[PDB]
Design a protein around this ligand. Sequence first.
Ligand SMILES: CCC[C@H](NC(=O)CCC(=O)O)C(=O)O
Ligand SMILES: CCC[C@H](NC(=O)CCC(=O)O)C(=O)O
Ligand SMILES: CCC[C@H](NC(=O)CCC(=O)O)C(=O)O
Lengths: 332, 332, 332
Amino acid sequence: LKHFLNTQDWSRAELDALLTQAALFKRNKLGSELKGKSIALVFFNPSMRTRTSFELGAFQLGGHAVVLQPGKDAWPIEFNLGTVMDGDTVEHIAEVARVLGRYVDLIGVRAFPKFVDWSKDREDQVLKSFAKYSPVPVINMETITHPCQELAHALALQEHFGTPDLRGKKYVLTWTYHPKPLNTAVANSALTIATRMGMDVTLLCPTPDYILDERYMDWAAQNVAESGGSLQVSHDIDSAYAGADVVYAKSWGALPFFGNWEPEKPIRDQYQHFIVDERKMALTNNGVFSHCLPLRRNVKATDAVMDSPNCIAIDEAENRLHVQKAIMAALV
Amino acid sequence: LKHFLNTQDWSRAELDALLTQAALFKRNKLGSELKGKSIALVFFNPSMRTRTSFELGAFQLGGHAVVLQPGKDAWPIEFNLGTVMDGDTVEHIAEVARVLGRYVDLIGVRAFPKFVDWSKDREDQVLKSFAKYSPVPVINMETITHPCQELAHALALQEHFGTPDLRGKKYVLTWTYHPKPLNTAVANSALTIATRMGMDVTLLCPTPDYILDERYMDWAAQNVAESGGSLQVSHDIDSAYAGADVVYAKSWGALPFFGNWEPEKPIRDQYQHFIVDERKMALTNNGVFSHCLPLRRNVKATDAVMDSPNCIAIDEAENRLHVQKAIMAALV
Amino acid sequence: LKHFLNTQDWSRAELDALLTQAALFKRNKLGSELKGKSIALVFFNPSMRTRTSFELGAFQLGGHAVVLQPGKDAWPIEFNLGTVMDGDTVEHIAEVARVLGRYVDLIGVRAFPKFVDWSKDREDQVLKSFAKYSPVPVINMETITHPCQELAHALALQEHFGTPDLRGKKYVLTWTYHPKPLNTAVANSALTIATRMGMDVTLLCPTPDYILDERYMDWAAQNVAESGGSLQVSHDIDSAYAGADVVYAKSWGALPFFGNWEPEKPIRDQYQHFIVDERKMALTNNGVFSHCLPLRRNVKATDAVMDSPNCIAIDEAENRLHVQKAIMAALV
Ligand SMILES: CCC[C@H](NC(=O)CCC(=O)O)C(=O)O
Ligand SMILES: CCC[C@H](NC(=O)CCC(=O)O)C(=O)O
Ligand SMILES: CCC[C@H](NC(=O)CCC(=O)O)C(=O)O
């Protein structure tokens, strides 16, 4: 059974096919690839773009999306095995998955880490659980990786440079400020897709503490070795931005401090200058700037940068609808 | 780009056309004016009638409604410009609108005032923001005015009197009791539509403190001067109800006391007799009584009055579905 | 006007017809029995299976479901008559029903008891209110009885034994442990359907305190007298499980202790051994085990029992979708 948990699990040929069908669905939004079918969208965290682009994509394809929010409407799920359920968890994913598997044709899930212990959050238990017990294809709507966002990003880029081949482009994935520590998910997915697309990726972040987990720094290496691109870390802003083609901002907490954020507040606070501003965008080769959104203005980026024509975040967001339709149509 | 923020922005010819298409949709509920299209319903406050009649109207027209509740499911939005987003607001309406604008064909928004400072609430910032940044038509689902409800009301009336011409009818818009101060929105919209329809509007309320904002009292004046009707204020019950044709109840807090309700509690509390009862309905020319709902029984109106055959609140509510389908079909 | 509040209100011929159309819809999921129609699903409590199977069933039949959650999205309703609404209730069911009656073709409602006073909860006020004021057919999505679940259960059984006639089968409806006291609804519905299907029902529970309300113990009697089966109470486990064909577990609080659960905690706590385990399932005539779900693993049943092939809870759950489509198609 084929799922869509990470782009990494897919071959370059399949990804390529996915971006093209995306491009296609973008030319003709309506179809019947999902006529009579349906998908259960399970959210354990907030969402606007994801929720909306999926709910519409299913409608635009003849299917129907059923949104579920365990804890709000649906019953809270248990993921640990053999555990004795006498706490707050009402049912077990082993039953929930097999059941959704009787009503729907697809299952999408969204569950940000709990931020208490990275060791435990890096196992991506919810998504893996779903994938294991579900008799139907499972789709990552973001956990510790945001595969869907990756393709939307990749397409917005291929669109911008007028070609599918993005090799040779200097891609700068920059960390950026945020009053509180956020999920690394997108940063990981960015690094993964940027390296996979064969670009000259530069992971810009404040201190070595902010470097992404090894798994992802390693997936990146294999991608370079494959796409003939390159990965590189930089703690110096200007040296990075210097003549870039693409610039993706994303704030996230330092993994080492998981479960111990107190000592990090003072640390991140001294890097607010990482915000993406015109000055930095000036240092680029008329580069394009993007973000997954929701973006906090004048914190992650400046009003100028957002209103700037080089900001393709809106297009990238819209592609989420086309990319996801390609993923669903594929999986069925 | 044409929106539907207020009936006032529309010419009488257009409104007239809207009520007729409403009457039409009421004869044949199913159509394809929205085939393949969709609308994002953004609610910052509770709703039953609005949510339901829109969600169904879109379905009855081949479209699809995507309900969003910033703060519950979707991410909380920021409306102030240049502000530095390091608080509770996660994204800015400038991005949210442009984005929804990539997924949907229409956007509906509902945001009651915050009741802290009328000066700030009277600017209808959320609706105006949406209208400004959205590349697609925006629809007022109620803010400081309830345009949609107006047409539902106007149609229920034209239906009741068997004619579109409601001139000459004595329309009494009466304030009514409620333990807590409520939005003036409906009262404004009532005054606006009643005067616009050319009736003999009488704004009945306890003290001059309860008279509606100037903007609305002025829109009303221009409507009289146009429709050849009349506006009038009354602090005396009986003199008002006296031989009326229409009676619309609605409770709301006194604008002067915005942000300072403590001193108003004792004031409203001494007007509970404003409740709509049989006695008052007796003083009318076999008039018809209505309310936008949700109505608190035996507080705003008496059980008798509601169960009375002259109560057309249920029909008025149902029209909300027909009126709104006319508005959507129009806007696309 | 015909509703679906309880299976009891229906004749055996109608129920029989319902299970067959269910079996049918199970062979061909898509249809147009609900083309253009819609149903308002009102939930005053959490739900996963019910919400999802209804929302999809309506979609699979050309209709549209509109989910409403009074208190979350929709406004909180008042059910008591003549009461003076100056509290938390915003509108009255008399208006809500008549209104939904103008937008939808069907209304489903879910409202678990309040657990404060059984005397008051046994009147099933919400469902009865809905049925009374609604001009359209009302469907019990579970209150003090779970009619829908009954048919899903009955079908999963007829499917398992390869025949519609389940007479002669030893049906053991066993109470089971749960840290907190739960609704008796399902237990009642089980007793009702098991006896109605003409099986040898045995109500297994700890102490006479746990025996279900008289109404249900009496409906059961009349069912036996009709279906030629039998009802029986057992406080001894083994004597019950002993060579059974069907085993339905369900935890619920002792009715006598309604509003006074303190003194029951210590009582239920000494019956955790009621959990359904392999040992007990061994004592059965290769019986089949089921539960309505959501089930708390290693509390109500053991991991073994759930993963056991005799556990038909997943199939029973899936039937909820087929059974409910038969109920809707019928009611319109
Ligand atoms: C697609 C982005 C989802 C998420 N974003 C947040 O939860 C940020 C919340 C905030 O800044 O208030 C994240 O960090 O990955
Ligand atoms: C269509 C009416 C919406 C709203 N009503 C309320 O929020 C009243 C709430 C209450 O009375 O509990 C208002 O005052 O305009
Ligand atoms: C279909 C079952 C619905 C409900 N179940 C619960 O509310 C159990 C909640 C829990 O065990 O946490 C009940 O008891 O009837």
